[model samples]
Target: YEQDKTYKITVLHTNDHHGHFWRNEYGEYGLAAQKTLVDGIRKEVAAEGGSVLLLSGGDINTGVPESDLQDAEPDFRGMNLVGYDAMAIGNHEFDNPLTVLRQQEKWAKFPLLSANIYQKSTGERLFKPWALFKRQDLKIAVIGLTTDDTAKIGNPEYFTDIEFRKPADEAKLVIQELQQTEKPDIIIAATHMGHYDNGEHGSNAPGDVEMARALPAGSLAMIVGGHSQDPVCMAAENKKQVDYVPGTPCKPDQQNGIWIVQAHEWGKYVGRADFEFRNGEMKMVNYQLIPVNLKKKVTWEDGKSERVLYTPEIAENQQMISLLSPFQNKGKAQLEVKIGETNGRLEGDRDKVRFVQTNMGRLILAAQMDRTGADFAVMSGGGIRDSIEAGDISYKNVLKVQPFGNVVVYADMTGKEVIDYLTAVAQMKPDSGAYPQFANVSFVAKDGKLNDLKIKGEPVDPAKTYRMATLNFNATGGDGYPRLDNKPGYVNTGFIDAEVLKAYIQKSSPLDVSVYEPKGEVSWQ
Candidate 1:
């Protein structure tokens, strides 16, 4: 390592690319369109006599039908063509089960990194903790991290045999080892964990912000993060307070001088962090989150003056596009398959569905109850991802609304059990996944207490056990509903949730969304 000479390295990164392999409806960046941004950077870096490393923070799956149906195959193939160096294994990486993720690891030419995950039984690491890549005579050590919240956030069933240790616990150990062995010029922590000002989980388990702030000043040069789907630049504290803004770069870490960056979710932006190294110390010189598409003023056929979003004219790389074509083509045809129609828009807004009653939530619960013939049904409001617009419905549209792949499950709950469960549900506020939405059930929450409960339009009996239907994720005690686990006569019907909703809509064609009214209210005054 020369002290007097200066060199540069450009790190091109993307995060939370939940299967948006092509340009989305909003005309934002997708994997294919991002190639232009990536190539432009690579060419500029080459001109500077510098090197580049393409990395993803995490969450490469579980959004659209193309990736979900094929278990992110197209994603891996496209990344391979795009020449990814490595990726942090996101929590959603485990959404399809460990076996599927392993297959995806094989599908990708790039290594998947997760330093904190280990096998519970074997007491060994599940994936490589760090990767050392040599680029243009500079040794760059990329340390990977995943959030421990994956246990609850990504579905507990997937990790029954695995242990996700706190990232800080593992990073310290890994960094000590890397210092002795790898001796890289620059160290980069590419983490899939979101930024948090406080150690929201606990004192020892610091969030990415805290971890970066606490790190030995020069131990790591850059921290690339994800999971909250928000962009972070220099500071994590201020960014967490506002909504995610695209086309803007986050500020770098003020203290350690480490550059922290995350591209917003769904392949919408290509985050670039350029660093200039002098005397073996790295300094972040620039940062940018390039949107996949540009908002341009284009005349419509009707001559309406409006800003139209359009993907850049950079020629699509055939290798990347060809690799993703099969899944894209199949997904297009499948999404076009009509299943039912809606006379009115079904509300799936997070604030409304999670904190209050939503017609979409009610309709989903009604479908669960109708399909299983259960006395009542409850759904996790956050599980509903999108709302149905007023018009014809397709299997694709239903999948968008319920993309979690949760299945219909049946369980028994007594009135007391229901009260306890609803009480916990009431504790949740807007945007929390644990909030409850239901059909054939109503319960008012006041002063943090639930009362006036009714099941099947009858006053609940404390001693009576009633059949209830919910998503498999909930029935298996996910989303803060551990009481549902280990119950007698519990059944996993294996009925796909989206399919159930699709079937219900078919039977109730021209379904009037207005009929799905609010059943209960939450009040504190």
Candidate 2:
């Protein structure tokens, strides 16, 4: 450790990928463009005698029908082409069975790291906990951590043999271990635990801010994170950028002498941090959230509107495009097949669905109940991603609405248990994805409790058992829903939500949207 020796390093990162490996219809945020941008950064840094480390905060699964249908094979393979050094294991990594995850691991060229997830029986780490990198004679230890909320928010069927430990606690232990063994000059965490403002995580498990505070100041040099899926730009200390427009001057959040950064979801941006390490201290010299061909709509004179890039356009890597086109074409063919028809729009708009019951919410629950033969059903508003417009419904439309790949599930519960479940669900605040949506049920929310509850026009009977339908994500405690998968009579139907919805629409073609409209069944005081 020479007192006067200085090391120049650059860190490039992204997170919450959620399957946007290919650009959208508007020609934005494809892995091809991302490859071109990162390549440019690497070349620039090399010219300056600085080394680069490429990392991801995890969540490379779910979202986008194209990737989901292929079990994220293209996404993982594309990451290989982009040359990721390492990535955190996001909760959605468990969306499919463990077998699929193993295949994805094989497809990925970089290690998928998660120190907090382990095998319950053998007490073995499920993925590599950390990876050490040597950059210009500097030993950098990158430990990975996933949010413990994964135990609740992930698909429980695949987690029967897995355990998710508290991330901050695990990170502390890992850092101590690295200090004793690796004695790396720089320690950083590539985390899927999210970035909460000033550690106000609320219902979420503690995030990067809390983890940084839990450690001694300077213990961690930085944290690259995801899951909250927002640009980690600070408007002020502990305050995030509001209405963040892409390509603006960005500032990373710092706590306990640790810098935290996250690129917004999809391939929207690539976060870059240039640092100088001297006397065992790391100082950031520059940082930016570079938009990846992200665009904004502008109406020119005469009311003509067009989408334009927020930043200078980065050309797509021709080789990368050639590598991904086959997967894209395969997915496109499967998605375009017409499944059914709709008479009018099924409203699943975020502003409307989270605040109030809509036809889309009721329709989703109705499909679930029909498949499971349940007396009633409920789901989180956040699960619905898009709306179905009038006309022929394609498999693509179904996937757009239910993109998470959550399976339909049902539980048989005593009337008393149902009461308890509704009591907690009714209290989920509006303006969030956790808001409850119901089908074949009604209740009054007053004085912070559910009252006058009824299922299918009948009052609940304490001694009776009733079957309720929902998604495995909720049954497993997603969106803070009570755990129902462990209930005595719970059953995971193994039916993919989008597939079920497609079948329902096909069987009930010419759907009349009015039939699913809310009629003040759920009254709030």
Candidate 3:
């Protein structure tokens, strides 16, 4: 081996892309803009005699309607075009279902790493935990670390079929495995757990801070982080991008040291890092984070941090204009299939699926319970992202109201498990978006203060088995319903609740929103 050659690797990562598939108010993933910024830097880095690696941080699911229309598999095709060497899995990967994820994993040419998730029954690693690629003389290991929150928030049925271990525990093990077994010269963690100091976000780069600290000391090379949206540059390097320094022409500068960092969401910016290795050990020689604003629209207002804005002229790029064209592509709406009607508009504030009087929640539960003959129904607050318009109810509106592939799962749980479930829910912060939403049950608290929750006409009976209908999130403990961990009598109906809702909508066609409201008792302060 030639001992005197100096080699450097450039790493680029994208996190929380959130399917910016369409030209939104900000532009397509702000890419038409990001491209201009990155190309300039790509050339500068080339001049410095370095190679690049591109990857994503995760949460690549269920956002824009087109991505959704594609069955959300991305056919794993988009990564290649966008340039991803590896990708991390986020909780949203399960939004479509394990099968859909499996399909994406199949078609994608790149490695989608998830260090902690596995198949519990068989103990098989559900997804490839990590991947390695060679950049000239450097052997780089890109390990995927997804958020443990997935273990709690996805539909429960999926959990019964798979297991996602906690990230911290998994990291301790992965670091050991990488060092002892794989032994790559560079270990870059593309994480979705997000970063922080003391696990509380002092700065938005909380994931990077906590992940770096968790390793004890030099457990890995560096971290590429995600989740909390923050513009992080300079891995503690003084070589700042000089464009912000007086009247110097905009240019990419040198690199920085082994500090973890991340770009904000939607690929608005790209993360750049440098690594140098030899003598069985590697260190950062030159590292500086260059913010990529492809279209030169966002003005660097303060020398403080990167904040982008809409450049009125360049904002309408051909790529975005074509996608967002007013032509028939995305313009065509689905034909009507109204199954039910609401009184007017349901605010969906009940936040628990087991019980509530909101028309949207009630109708959803009623439709499921009515179809499956379920004694009760339960769902999550996050699943209901939008509201029902009061006027003409259409088929498209109903599906949008309950978009997850969550089927109507039926479980015959002992009354004790059900109460324990509610107790667990009662324990969540009232403001949490994770709280489950619901149907005909009532409670005693006013202004939405949770008091004695009544599911049927009686206090929950611990010994008796209760038949219930709910989506996968709450059933699996997503949003903190821990009671679902190992309830024996639980039965999965194998029917998606959305199908039932669709049926209801088609029959009722043109449902009204007036039926949904915050009833029962809530102590609204």
Candidate 4:
């Protein structure tokens, strides 16, 4: 029998849009440019005559001023404004809460699917497994999955009640079930598994690659991946390996080898793959990730002025400009306005960050803890990415004080567990020569060894519960404290630390950023 005629399907994908509503840095997309580019692609597809499927891997909302403006307009109105066909969940979507998430899903007009993320209350999957796009004789299945770290990466208040399951296990259950039932000719796994820096998980997705390998002889086809926010495309074949990715099977290579693709974040690029399938199997592949140039796209939108529309025309919209007009004076522009009053000014330099005796480290937490009126405050040495000079102030200093946007929260823990937390912090070994920072609560680790310290000048009490103000990161064993967060009676009392810092700024003017030098060095024995 001669092979069935070949069919071609085109896929266009983007991930981590971060809701950049405006054009690129050069001011191209500004809504109009993006619309034109998308329209152009559809036109080209029509011009060539082919089947196309559009997909995105989460993070369709959140990021810039425009997106934020729209976020205020509604639940993911930005994504609806952008038009995504079907998308997987991205961790950022949960920044508000599950209730808001459901609202956004309803508003999206696109199918939002995630097989791995489940409702903690019911132990049932929170989203649909996959979507089928039928094109004539083609049965296309698109499976959606999100990164598993949503709870840990977001604010405690936002995800305290949510949970993400293993992606690999989720994939197999869905895939096996799909094969037994719908049995699509091509299966596209859309995910936000993301990429790692070095030796990082190539598309951290668990089963995406392996499940592609486990495709029963010829069941699955392609995988679209996102997160880690980069343009990427890769093909990996399974060799009868077990547990290939996060949520799929470990069986050996079947006829269904997997092809994966990803696009850079912020609408910077679009990925396309042309596949030739004959006799219900893939025969050839042509792949490319194309960059979206704002200048040209905007030039097209500008229609020959060519000077280009680099900024928003609505910069003076009556409602928007008036609403934002007051926020500019909300303290001072990020470039202007001194924040808070300090005993002395402080400068953020590498040397200052290294000075344990400098007042900068102490003041950063003092401002933060004082802002929250907590008994004591702790900020990771990593939390202070730069050194702040004493006295002079700018909105920049507030940002430098807490660059990561980490919210400060209070946790109640046993004194013994507190010692254990500090002990783990002391384990830094000094080979790295890095140290964690704290306020009100002081410790003396002589000769790089852990010590019994004074909490309000009393010998450390192992049995008592102390009210410790630490960010979610430190409480959860990030940067340095692993056991500190798990201490007995540990409770998460929430507050956005940066907002507190802002309040602290308004309370004190020309707030001096100071330097701190600990009497003793901070290396472990």
Candidate 5:
């Protein structure tokens, strides 16, 4: 094996596309734009006689109308057209049923892999766990693992029949299996389990970082990570690779030999890493996380100033567009059907809504209360997915706001119970989904305690009981709101929350805005 021969393996990766095939305001970051970049990169690699491995870290379902309307079948078709070699099963892959995912798997040209997911009753593996390929005398094994949080992140019903185990142990088992039988030159863990410094993310299961550290040197060559929706690139010489503290940069120029890369979410960028092999050992010789950009800068005003304008290097794929038209046309047509108008902008900014109350939050709460006739409505800010500009609204816009299709439900809580719940919400700061948004109820939260709590402008009394309306996601304790689940007198309203919002808008045409004020305030220290 002392031959001086060299082989180049080029890996092109993307993660958490969420069905964004159409170009956004940014000309070069959409799925169509991503196609141009991926195609161009593959061509260049092919020209150099190097093998290209195209893969997605997952979250291929749920987001834009084109993909959401058809439950991401068009996305499956688009990815198939893009010529993906493989994709790790993501948490959102279970948003629908397992049967739906099977249909999607049938549509894909490549295998969807996960080493940790299993059938609950029979203990059978759900996916192939990994895929093996040979290119020019080089044997490569790619193992995949889904995030253990999939049990929490997706619909609870969709995952009742399966179990998500710790990724590190599964990765080790797969690596050992490959070593014994295949003796592959390289092993890559293409995982949907995201990277973090902490050992596990709330599930007691090892994250991608832990899995990487657990693997001995040469057991795994690279780890392509996902689920965090942030940009990460690690090429460290140490067997454990870079120390993955949150908010710290991993300098690629450092002499790190192991590789890990995660492009930011929404098809914004493509991660590229190159592995050079010689004498049966792989080396991370080059790596980059490239942002998709088509804008060009030109000097203006007699060279005193400059302006940027888009200059697309490649046109959108007509064939793919034709394939997508079936979904897009119907989605757009629904979006064009005017439902009503808003008097002011409905704030959907994630930061504001997550931390404080917004008008959009009030509107949805009002809709839930109106439809259910509950005493009050409570919702997590995370449930509000998008904001709406003032003026004409449509069914499409509402769908974007409530993209999860959460079920509406009502639960009974005494005044003391509500205050206790409020206390849990107050402690949820910085990074949380428990920040409460409600209608016909108000409270003052300070120093992680609920104070001045009121029900319909009256001070809270321990004896009083309140009927609370909320999405089933939260009622079932999604996003760590554990207080609402399995409570007495709980009732599912049997209505889709997004459709409820649409009906509310239609009933209150040309909705007035001034009355929808913040019902709660946070007295920060």
Candidate 6:
């Protein structure tokens, strides 16, 4: 290796796409605009005698009704047009069956990599572990890793033949293999394992920071990550970035000499890291989390408001628009079909639902309870995605509220078991997706314990058995929920959540949102 020779490489990445193939009404974060920005960056880097590698931290599925309904076809096809080199397999990739994932793989132009996922039946690796790239006489090794928590949080039905092993273990082994075989000049990881500041990942599996620290110094040059869905910005002294403002100068987190970066979810930003490699050493020269037409709402003195872009607008690629317009239009047509009517809004905003009880949470539980004939229902606040506005409700509204396609499930638990379950769930910290939400149950939570617990206005009897309804995702341990799927009394109803909600709304048309409002059923200290 010549010490005087330096190689310039620019790594552009995004993660947690969650099905935003097209832009929103505010014209933000569509593949068309992202294509333009990436193309411009590629051209600029080429002009400067540099190379570019485009990657995704994974999670190109779920969320929007348009993309979800099509199994994220447009999202994958559009990624081909945008030119991704590789991506890790996110947990949400298992939301559907292996068949759908196979189809998605067919649609994707880039390799869907995951080093630790394996076939349980044969113990063979399920996806490609890594890909070797050559740019400007430089050998770059990009390995992919997924969070081991995928086994706990993903749909369990899909796991009968699949296994998720610890990513850090796989990462170390792969690096050793690469060094002995490929002898790549540089090594990095494209991961869906998330970025937890300083490795403080309570409940969730260890993420990028922990993986970086577990390895020897300089084992990995960098980690492009997702799952936590943060901007990967850091404050002084390695503190987490709180209230990270968009379009600002951003810095990546470094642990054990490895840089970790994540562009926030939904393609809202494209994270760019420019590196200079010389004599077997790599240094990041510049970093930025470029906002993709992100906007801020400003109110005028006259009381009107308008959204202004946080940065200069990037033009949308005409080719991308032409390719995806048909899928978008078809999705809109199906979603617009009316389902029911409401008298007032049902709140499900994360700020409100994740901290306090909301009618939207209760409504979902009510539907599940109705379908399963359960005495009560419980769910995580994060499961409720969006609010249902007043007046006629459409399929789109229902899908927006519960887009994960989780099945309705019920478990018959003894009163003592229910008490123990609630004790753990009620203590899940607020302001996070793991926060608890309940319906048809009342209890005062104090000092992390439940008091005066009652179901349907009757005190819980220890000798009696109660049927509890929930989404299969919860029963299978999603959001750190206690696993109930293995219980003899547990049953998955094969009822999709959004469909159940839509049916409930249709049956209870002209619904008054206040009927499901929290009325001291759950009190916190």
lDDT: worst 10-residue window of model 5: 247-256
User: Per-residue lDDT of 1-525 in model 2, one digit per residue for the tens?
Assistant: 578788889999999999899999999999999999999999999998889999999999888888888998889999999999999999888878888889998999899999999999999999889999988678999999999888675555677789999999999899999999999999989999989898999878899999999997899889999999889999999999988999788999999999999998998999999999898778899999999999999998999999998988999999999999998999576689988888799999888888889999988888999999999999988888888898899998889899877889999999999888888889887777788999888888798887799998898999998999999888888877998887788999999998889888889888998898899889778
Evaluate model 3: give its TM-score: 0.69
Work out the TM-score per prediction: 0.92, 0.92, 0.69, 0.68, 0.87, 0.92
Candidate 6's C-alpha runs over 4 A off are: 1-3, 341-343, 390-392, 411-434, 445-450, 461-467, 476-493
Clash-forming residue pairs, model 5:
235-256, 236-256, 236-257, 237-256, 237-257
**Candidate 2 displacement at residue 347 in angstroms:** 3.4
Worst 10 residues of 3 by lDDT: 246-255
**Please, what is the whole-model Cα lDDT of each candidate in the order they appear?**
0.78, 0.90, 0.61, 0.59, 0.76, 0.90
Candidate 1 lDDT over 417-458, as tens digits, reads 877766776666665767777777766667778767777778
lDDT of 6 by residue, 237-337 (tens): 46668989998888899998999999989999999999998888798999999999999999999999999999999999999999999889995765898
Selected candidate, larger TM-score, 1 vs 4: 1
lDDT of 5 by residue, 1-525 (tens): 338888989988888888886666545566666777788888998898899998889988887765776788878888888778899999888877788899999999999999889989989998999999899988888888898878765566677789998888888788898999998888887888775543345533456666666677657777777787757744433223343332234333221234566776877667788878898778776776666653545667687654343333455767777776676677577677899999989988777777877889889999998888887777888787799889899888888888887889987778788777766755666434556676777666667766677767787678887787888887777766754667766889789998899999999878888777674443534
Model 6, residue 425: displacement in angstroms?
A: 5.1
Worst lDDT run of 10 residues, candidate 6, spans 151-160
Q: What TM-score, to 2 decimals, does candidate 4 have?
A: 0.68
lDDT of 4: 0.59
Query: Per-residue lDDT of 351-394 in model 3, one digit per residue for the tens?
Result: 44323334666677777777767776756666665566566666
Could you tell which candidate, 2 or 3, scores higher by TM-score?
Answer: 2
